[PDB]
Amino acid sequence: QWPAPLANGGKSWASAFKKAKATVTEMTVEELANITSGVIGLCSGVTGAVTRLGIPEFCLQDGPIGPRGVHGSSQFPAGLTVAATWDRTLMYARARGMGQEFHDQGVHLALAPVTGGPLGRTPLNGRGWEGTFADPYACGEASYLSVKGLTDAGVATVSKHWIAYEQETSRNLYIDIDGVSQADIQLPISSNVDDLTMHELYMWSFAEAVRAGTNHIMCSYNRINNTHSCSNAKGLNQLLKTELNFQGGVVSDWGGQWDSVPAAENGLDVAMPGKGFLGALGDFWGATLVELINNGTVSEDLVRDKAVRILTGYYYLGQDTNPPPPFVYNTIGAPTLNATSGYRNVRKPGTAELIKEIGSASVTLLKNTGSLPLKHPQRIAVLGNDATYNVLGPNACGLANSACDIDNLNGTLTTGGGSGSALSPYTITPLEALQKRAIEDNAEIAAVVANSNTTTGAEDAIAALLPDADVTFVFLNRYSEEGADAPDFSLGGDGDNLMDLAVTYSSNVVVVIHTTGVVDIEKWADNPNVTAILVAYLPGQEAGNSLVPVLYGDVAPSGKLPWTWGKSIDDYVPNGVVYTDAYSPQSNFTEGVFIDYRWFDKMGITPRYEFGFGLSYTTFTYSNLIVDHGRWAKDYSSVMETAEPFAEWDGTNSLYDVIFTVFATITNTGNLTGSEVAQLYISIPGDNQPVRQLRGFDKIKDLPVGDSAVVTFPIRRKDVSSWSVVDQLWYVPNGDFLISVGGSSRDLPLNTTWTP
Amino acid sequence: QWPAPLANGGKSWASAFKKAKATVTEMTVEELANITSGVIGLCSGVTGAVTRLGIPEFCLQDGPIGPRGVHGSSQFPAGLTVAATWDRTLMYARARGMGQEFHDQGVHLALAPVTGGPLGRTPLNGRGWEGTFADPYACGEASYLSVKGLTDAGVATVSKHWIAYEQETSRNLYIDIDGVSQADIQLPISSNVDDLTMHELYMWSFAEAVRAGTNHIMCSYNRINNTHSCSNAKGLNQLLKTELNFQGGVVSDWGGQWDSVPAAENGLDVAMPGKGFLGALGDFWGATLVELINNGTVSEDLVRDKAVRILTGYYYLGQDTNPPPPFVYNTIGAPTLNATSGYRNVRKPGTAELIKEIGSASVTLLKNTGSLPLKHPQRIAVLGNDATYNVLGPNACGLANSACDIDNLNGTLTTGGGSGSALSPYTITPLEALQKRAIEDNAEIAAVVANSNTTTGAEDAIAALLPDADVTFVFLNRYSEEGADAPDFSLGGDGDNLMDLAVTYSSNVVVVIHTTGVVDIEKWADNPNVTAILVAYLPGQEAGNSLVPVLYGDVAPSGKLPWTWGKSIDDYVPNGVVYTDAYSPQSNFTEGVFIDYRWFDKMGITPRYEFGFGLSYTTFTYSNLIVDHGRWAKDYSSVMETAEPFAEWDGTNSLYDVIFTVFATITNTGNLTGSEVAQLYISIPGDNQPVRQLRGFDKIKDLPVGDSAVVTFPIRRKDVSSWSVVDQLWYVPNGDFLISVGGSSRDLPLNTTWTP
Numbered sequence A, B: 001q002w003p004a005p006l007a008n009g010g011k012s013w014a015s016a017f018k019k020a021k022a023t024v025t026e027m028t029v030e031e032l033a034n035i036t037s038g039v040i041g042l043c044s045g046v047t048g049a050v051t052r053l054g055i056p057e058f059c060l061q062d063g064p065i066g067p068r069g070v071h072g073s074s075q076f077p078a079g080l081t082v083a084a085t086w087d088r089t090l091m092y093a094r095a096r097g098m099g100q101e102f103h104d105q106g107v108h109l110a111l112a113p114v115t116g117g118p119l120g121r122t123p124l125n126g127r128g129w130e131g132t133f134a135d136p137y138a139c140g141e142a143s144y145l146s147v148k149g150l151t152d153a154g155v156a157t158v159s160k161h162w163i164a165y166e167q168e169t170s171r172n173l174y175i176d177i178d179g180v181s182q183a184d185i186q187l188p189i190s191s192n193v194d195d196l197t198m199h200e201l202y203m204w205s206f207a208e209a210v211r212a213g214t215n216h217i218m219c220s221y222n223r224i225n226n227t228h229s230c231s232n233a234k235g236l237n238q239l240l241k242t243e244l245n246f247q248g249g250v251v252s253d254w255g256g257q258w259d260s261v262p263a264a265e266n267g268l269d270v271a272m273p274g275k276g277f278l279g280a281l282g283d284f285w286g287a288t289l290v291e292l293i294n295n296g297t298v299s300e301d302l303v304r305d306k307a308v309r310i311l312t313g314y315y316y317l318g319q320d321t322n323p324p325p326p327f328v329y330n331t332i333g334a335p336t337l338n339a340t341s342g343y344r345n346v347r348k349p350g351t352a353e354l355i356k357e358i359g360s361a362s363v364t365l366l367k368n369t370g371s372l373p374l375k376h377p378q379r380i381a382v383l384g385n386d387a388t389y390n391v392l393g394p395n396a397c398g399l400a401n402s403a404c405d406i407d408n409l410n411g412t413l414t415t416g417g418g419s420g421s422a423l424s425p426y427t428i429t430p431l432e433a434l435q436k437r438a439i440e441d442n443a444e445i446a447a448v449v450a451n452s453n454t455t456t457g458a459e460d461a462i463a464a465l466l467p468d469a470d471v472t473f474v475f476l477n478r479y480s481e482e483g484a485d486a487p488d489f490s491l492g493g494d495g496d497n498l499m500d501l502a503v504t505y506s507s508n509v510v511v512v513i514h515t516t517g518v519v520d521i522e523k524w525a526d527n528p529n530v531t532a533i534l535v536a537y538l539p540g541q542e543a544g545n546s547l548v549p550v551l552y553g554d555v556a557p558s559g560k561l562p563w564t565w566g567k568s569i570d571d572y573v574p575n576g577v578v579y580t581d582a583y584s585p586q587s588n589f590t591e592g593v594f595i596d597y598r599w600f601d602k603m604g605i606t607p608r609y610e611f612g613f614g615l616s617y618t619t620f621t622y623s624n625l626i627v628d629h630g631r632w633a634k635d636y637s638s639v640m641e642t643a644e645p646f647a648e649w650d651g652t653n654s655l656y657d658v659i660f661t662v663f664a665t666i667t668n669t670g671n672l673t674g675s676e677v678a679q680l681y682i683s684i685p686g687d688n689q690p691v692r693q694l695r696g697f698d699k700i701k702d703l704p705v706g707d708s709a710v711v712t713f714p715i716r717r718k719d720v721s722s723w724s725v726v727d728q729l730w731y732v733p734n735g736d737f738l739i740s741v742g743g744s745s746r747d748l749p750l751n752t753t754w755t756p
């Protein structure tokens, strides 16, 4: 029994809380029920107004790359893409730019960011791309900064999806169309997760989200230990609202709520989407919640807390005294909502170049045999539909980027499909950026952008073009979307065919991959004719113009992989996606904390490219490890505080105090200016413990040839602790702590031991 | 009986002739036969060397937009496209730029320009686009300047195709593969042409070519009065080499020569391609011509004249003392010629911008209801595959731009198909130019570039996109090629469908047409939803960036139609293309001189847009006609002279003396700077005579609002004459000459009468 704990406003929201409570205390039962459930409107979800007290409808709006379904905005790169920069500044600026467009379109609550659900159990996850690293620490850091960027713009965050939401297949959102109900077919997948794993792996990034001041959290579609996340008392009432001390609200995923009373008692604050979407995704608390309070079944006290948690965000971001503008676009779509759209342009100068910079900083060089950077080649060939436009238009796939035909030539993969996608004012195609440069060089350039397998002449055109080209670019992609997991690592479209042809007719093939996750290139990776391989992830609207400068040496590539690139899907955590028709599907997380590189490291498995890998046009030599135990500091800068119990607690100190700081020195040992992502790993001693765990990163920007720079890694008490299942608290174990530093999770030239 | 007249070198080539004759006089019979017939080589045709006297192989090379089948060059706009500028300066510069690329690739003889074959009898002609105006006077002027531009670059011209070559269908070039010979199937079409028509219509532009110093002329595939052009004594020996006093050589079209002895006796100088193309197109004079001289059948004298005519060009352009570089590309193609290609880059700074300027000057505004120039629209839609790249690459259609599949999306129509096409280093697509501008405006832009009739989702994508666009661009094309005539005026690809959809979903549709000739837009032209219509012809490699500035008002459109745009194919000269299986096909030119606008004017037929029509963004008011009879001048500036007999000949004067000059004044009466093409027409009195005939044009560049400029029209004796069939000479008739001036062939606000 995990009772609903009362909100008190915590640290930064004290005055907002007090206002929220004053306002909530005035409300009738109808009004409590109005604000805690969704109504029909232009946004993804809309809270009911409390019209007597001048509380307007709040506009809740997808999604984690910025406002979805909206014109007059910019298409930012996806979370995956910022992760790959390993650049905290970029992580924040991105979220801050997303925030002004959210705010300036009229959004009260952004359904963003993705802060560790899905985190990365399976590399086939259809929506893994919406997140950031397959790693609790790095996801933590990027989640914190993404939240800060959105809240600093005046927009309230719904960080998602809590929790253990690690596969799309059989997620089974509630839907009751006709009598054809989901409860009659299959329950959602049940993530069965042990207590140590839940704390050390899945909760980690959500602790960071909380600490950054996420105003809300979204409970996920999956069950946990066979109880829906949105009505799991242990999950919401104890882990989130007691141990993490979460003062904000729990919003249901759309169809995440499966009942009225348990949801009300077990931690849910907001029923979405309520009356939207024809009430087809369940509507368990409108009029129904009024009757439940009035007849004695759910206490008014309990619903008052829900309403206070909703209204805290509103007052803390000054949305009362500085209201967002009206929201003007029908993002639901006819015939579900028949309403006209207005028009607003929210693209500010500076945004296009920030989107660019994220691209240039993210693009990750995996193989370079000598063909890059390019100098001034005269004859360029380009292969792949990914090099050009969607032939039906950049937004032809619709409001959620998922409605084009299975075989359509969608063009450059600038984002993925689903609630996490967004419209584009244009797309700067790789081919167009490459042409621009080729003109500057008085060169020629030609591209085969048809489906090579089904267009008459395409193979003959490729055979004729490639042999006289000084360089051949092949552009490959792999679309995935929310709602399904990728069946395998296979390339999308005619990727396999394009690669076969290109190696047959050219011995200087440069391969660029725009993708939602890892793909299968085993057939080509080791061919000498493939001279370079880059992965550019999901770069948003500035696809071409962020990549070409890297290709041409204007700026050296500095991105590194945010997950592990294994040679086979068999090399990962088993049963990453469970396929069953069983009424009550089960997914046992028997691996525990061992996901991504932790699996590979513990199991002695060699990846093709490891977590934290990415090449430069230069080399960096790591020297002079320092662990400085006198460089400690009190945690003063968290927006909100958790109540995570820890052994070393003395009433005055924090789990997030920095206990020591570690330094290293990098030197540019090669022939060109370059940026380097230094990483730090710690092997924390214990039973059945990861070979090593990321606990720092620091990116040196534009280090000249011969120059050196210090890299600095503040280490927090938490960074060195384990969860005691027996004592239910964090503690620093006894033993030798190996501290490693270098350029990847497997290129760790500096090691030392720390023993407390 | 029309004897072969001996070359004497004429006016400018006197010293070259003397050298040519000295060299020819040394040759053996083998060597005479070597240089007058084609050999295997990298070029379209190659004359045999005279190796003992250090006379190298000459490289004869297509085509009239510049060197075909070659990399490292530029794709110039087609002749049609320069005609539409009505800009003499552009006409010359184009040809001069074509010349340096020809010369710098190693070409001795350019198979260019097209100087009145085809001229424009039928608007369905598959290769009409290679020419310039459907008008003897204007074609004359552009032919003269095109020749001058090429010869001034050091390249010898083969002006083509002499003569009455007015349809591709049943042109029936000689070809003897196996025993499957063309003589066994069908003779070439027989242009049956009367003497007055041949002189006043078809010979006119070739007189100009001669006068500009065309070094060679190509005899055509067709028969005339049932005798092959290439062996028509009256045509070659008398009309060309006696009356026009042509001092240069007659090169056969490739398969234009049908026999050995008549060709030798009746005016042919050079048998092409001889041993090239497997000797499959006839090889009537190699070893065969040696035996004919040696056995007494053809006089050595006669073949000496052929060789002197070939070598005159060589010496006059200093190709002996300043040889072209070696020619490096296999332009024939395997398996016909199995030879590797080298590489040379010949693109000079300044050429891309000249190609652009020709585009900007040519694009012709046909309808403007108020939607242009654009200001700064925020939402742009674009329709049509013509807006983007060929999906297989810009040169995927091969060496003659004619080998892509019937349904391939070839992209922007930057040139036509056949021997007159050329490769492209890139193509600047309309969409890419429009995107560039749209970015500058912080606008959005989306394009449906699939085949709207056969791609799943394309019609739904168009329906969704168009209604919220501030403006919809539809890009339409119509490919034709040498070897076939267009069956009708129908749009290519899915043009009809695109236009239907666009008017259904948008009321501000702007239509841009890239075409080889007139098309059928009757279904849409009068729809209020079509707010503007432009025809951009064949703009070459700078398609997009020449059009967008005109669209946006950066420069006002100043092009005008070089032919008549009739509402129906039935409105033109009858039997424009004759289709028959008759062994000896006949085409009687019963219309006489009445082709294009002369037909329409005489027959009282209203075109949709007349010859010489094109709108501005301003208006020009024409005032103050002056005919100044004291402004006469002696013809001093012709490179070579004709021997056209004329009644007013006194031993001292010329048919090309300017006898008076006529002036008018234009004033910019509208609201914007603009350029205007003033035209002058003369109605020459007589029996069965054209309502009026173009005899001048003058383009005022960038006339500011309120300002005025004088327009000046020098009139030549020839410009006012008729051919006397009875007396076989030119004469100025008696009667009233109406002299009209204005902005089109039907907008002639200034008239006066001249009576000698």
Ligand SMILES: CC(=O)N[C@@H]1[C@@H](O)[C@H](O[C@@H]2O[C@H](CO[C@H]3O[C@H](CO[C@@H]4O[C@H](CO)[C@@H](O)[C@H](O)[C@@H]4O[C@H]4O[C@H](CO)[C@@H](O)[C@H](O)[C@@H]4O)[C@@H](O)[C@H](O[C@H]4O[C@H](CO)[C@@H](O)[C@H](O)[C@@H]4O)[C@@H]3O)[C@@H](O)[C@H](O[C@H]3O[C@H](CO)[C@@H](O)[C@H](O)[C@@H]3O[C@H]3O[C@H](CO)[C@@H](O)[C@H](O)[C@@H]3O)[C@@H]2O)[C@@H](CO)O[C@H]1O
Pocket: A193, A194, A195, A196, A725, A726, A727, A728, A729
């Ligand atoms: C699998 C998992 O993660 N389960 C967790 C629960 O562990 C967790 O609840 C905590 O459990 C703590 C005890 O730890 C041991 O608990 C389990 C023991 O039961 C076993 O069940 C299995 C059968 O399925 C058996 O294999 C096992 O032998 C044992 O069962 C049986 O043993 C007897 C035979 O000898 C038999 O007679 C009985 O039938 C008996 O049931 C065990 O599952 C667990 O193992 C996991 O962890 C270890 C170590 O990492 C790992 O190696 C294993 O593989 C497993 O993964 C472990 O060995 C218990 O101490 C906790 O209780 C504290 O906390 C709560 C809430 O805060 C308090 O109410 C309670 O009073 C107590 O707190 C007080 O005491 C401590 C100091 O003692 C103070 O610090 C504290 O502040 C406070 O004052 C707790 O109940 C729950 C939490 O909800 O999540 C599950 O997922």
Ligand SMILES: CC(=O)N[C@@H]1[C@@H](O)[C@H](O[C@@H]2O[C@H](CO[C@H]3O[C@H](CO[C@@H]4O[C@H](CO)[C@@H](O)[C@H](O)[C@@H]4O[C@H]4O[C@H](CO)[C@@H](O)[C@H](O)[C@@H]4O)[C@@H](O)[C@H](O[C@H]4O[C@H](CO)[C@@H](O)[C@H](O)[C@@H]4O)[C@@H]3O)[C@@H](O)[C@H](O[C@H]3O[C@H](CO)[C@@H](O)[C@H](O)[C@@H]3O[C@H]3O[C@H](CO)[C@@H](O)[C@H](O)[C@@H]3O)[C@@H]2O)[C@@H](CO)O[C@H]1O
Pocket: B193, B194, B195, B196, B725, B726, B727, B728, B729
């Ligand atoms: C159709 C066409 O264009 N044909 C031209 C030929 O015209 C041209 O050759 C020139 O012809 C000049 C004569 O003009 C008249 O000629 C034709 C007369 O023959 C007719 O044939 C048809 C039948 O098919 C009949 O309809 C017609 O009645 C006549 O035939 C018969 O008439 C008699 C009945 O009364 C009968 O007894 C006979 O059977 C006779 O054959 C005629 O076709 C032509 O008509 C065209 O032009 C007019 C006017 O534009 C037009 O209205 C018509 O519709 C037609 O289109 C026209 O009426 C002739 O003067 C020329 O001869 C000069 O030139 C050559 C070469 O330079 C010299 O060798 C010759 O000596 C002479 O030159 C000398 O004389 C003049 C002054 O007289 C001097 O200036 C000059 O310097 C020199 O000293 C010439 O033969 C040929 C050229 O190759 O092309 C054809 O296509």
Ligand SMILES: CC(=O)O[C@@]12CO[C@@H]1C[C@H](O[C@@H]1OC[C@@H](O)[C@H](O)[C@H]1O)[C@@]1(C)C(=O)[C@H](O)C3=C(C)[C@@H](OC(=O)[C@H](O)[C@@H](NC(=O)c4ccccc4)c4ccccc4)C[C@@](O)([C@@H](OC(=O)c4ccccc4)[C@H]21)C3(C)C
Pocket: A044, A062, A111, A160, A173, A175, A177, A180, A181, A182, A218, A253, A254, A255, A277, A278, A280, A281, A336, A400, A402, A417, A418, A419, A482, A483
């Ligand atoms: C069914 C469904 O998913 O509905 C939507 C509407 O809201 C949900 C959520 C989803 O997005 C998000 O999840 C992350 C949260 O942070 C967001 O707040 C949330 O929006 C939605 C909005 C969305 O954008 C998503 O991209 C979409 C999906 C996934 C489409 O859903 C499906 O394709 C369903 O599989 C399919 N279900 C069945 O066929 C079915 C199974 C069993 C029994 C009965 C039926 C389905 C269901 C309804 C309609 C089509 C397909 C659907 C979305 O269109 C969108 O849903 C609707 O538009 C809609 C749903 C129900 C009634 C009326 C309209 C989802 C689509 C945008 C493509």
Ligand SMILES: CC(=O)O[C@@]12CO[C@@H]1C[C@H](O[C@@H]1OC[C@@H](O)[C@H](O)[C@H]1O)[C@@]1(C)C(=O)[C@H](O)C3=C(C)[C@@H](OC(=O)[C@H](O)[C@@H](NC(=O)c4ccccc4)c4ccccc4)C[C@@](O)([C@@H](OC(=O)c4ccccc4)[C@H]21)C3(C)C
Pocket: B044, B062, B111, B160, B173, B175, B177, B180, B181, B182, B218, B253, B254, B255, B277, B278, B280, B281, B336, B400, B402, B417, B418, B419, B482, B483
């Ligand atoms: C048949 C033919 O046209 O041959 C070519 C080779 O030279 C001729 C001329 C043509 O271009 C030009 O005309 C203007 C002049 O100024 C130029 O100097 C001249 O080159 C050619 C070079 C060319 O570029 C043209 O674009 C091409 C055409 C038109 C192709 O010709 C055909 O499609 C023929 O209709 C077809 N004929 C028959 O099928 C046939 C009819 C009756 C009896 C027997 C056969 C044909 C013939 C041969 C091969 C394919 C098709 C062919 C060109 O490829 C090119 O010709 C050859 O490559 C070639 C011809 C013969 C033997 C070996 C090679 C013409 C093509 C470039 C596409």
Ligand SMILES: CC(=O)N[C@@H]1[C@@H](O)[C@H](O)[C@@H](CO)O[C@H]1O
Pocket: A049, A050, A051, A055, A056, A057
């Ligand atoms: C469905 C409906 O009645 N909507 C009204 C809306 O028109 C009004 O502006 C608002 C004031 O809070 O209250 C809503 O309830």
Ligand SMILES: CC(=O)N[C@@H]1[C@@H](O)[C@H](O)[C@@H](CO)O[C@H]1O
Pocket: B049, B050, B051, B055, B056, B057
């Ligand atoms: C087919 C052949 O023999 N070609 C030769 C060529 O190698 C040589 O350079 C040239 C000198 O004029 O003479 C040609 O006849």
Ligand SMILES: *[C@@H]1O[C@H](CO)[C@@H](O)[C@H](O)[C@H]1NC(C)=O
Pocket: A288, A291, A292, A295, A297
């Ligand atoms: C309370 O109301 C709910 C919702 O109307 C209903 O399901 C339930 O049976 C009611 N209970 C009582 C005790 O009236």
Ligand SMILES: *[C@@H]1O[C@H](CO)[C@@H](O)[C@H](O)[C@H]1NC(C)=O
Pocket: A334, A335, A336, A337, A338
């Ligand atoms: C939207 O309109 C269509 C008919 O135009 C109708 O079928 C549909 O039910 C409407 N939707 C709603 C929610 O009223």
Ligand SMILES: *[C@@H]1O[C@H](CO)[C@@H](O)[C@H](O)[C@H]1NC(C)=O
Pocket: A503, A504, A505, A506, A507, A527, A528, A529
């Ligand atoms: C590499 O490319 C060349 C063509 O340039 C081809 O001949 C060769 O077979 C290719 N090598 C491999 C390993 O595919």
Ligand SMILES: *[C@@H]1O[C@H](CO)[C@@H](O)[C@H](O)[C@H]1NC(C)=O
Pocket: A192, A586, A587, A588
């Ligand atoms: C998951 O683990 C539980 C706990 O032992 C087990 O009882 C259950 O049957 C397992 N389900 C699987 C492997 O699907």
Ligand SMILES: *[C@@H]1O[C@H](CO)[C@@H](O)[C@H](O)[C@H]1NC(C)=O
Pocket: B288, B291, B292, B295, B297
């Ligand atoms: C002259 O030679 C040609 C070509 O070889 C031949 O056709 C003809 O019959 C010969 N004539 C004589 C009279 O020998």
Ligand SMILES: *[C@@H]1O[C@H](CO)[C@@H](O)[C@H](O)[C@H]1NC(C)=O
Pocket: B334, B335, B336, B337, B338
């Ligand atoms: C070119 O080579 C092919 C085989 O590679 C051969 O069939 C053809 O006849 C060759 N052409 C010539 C003109 O020798």
Ligand SMILES: *[C@@H]1O[C@H](CO)[C@@H](O)[C@H](O)[C@H]1NC(C)=O
Pocket: B503, B504, B505, B506, B507, B527, B528, B529
């Ligand atoms: C013009 O466009 C509108 C849509 O904007 C359409 O309703 C109307 O039918 C069209 N008019 C014509 C003449 O096609």
Ligand SMILES: *[C@@H]1O[C@H](CO)[C@@H](O)[C@H](O)[C@H]1NC(C)=O
Pocket: B192, B586, B587, B588
């Ligand atoms: C062309 O005109 C001639 C001269 O009158 C005539 O004899 C011939 O039969 C005509 N051919 C046609 C109309 O095809």
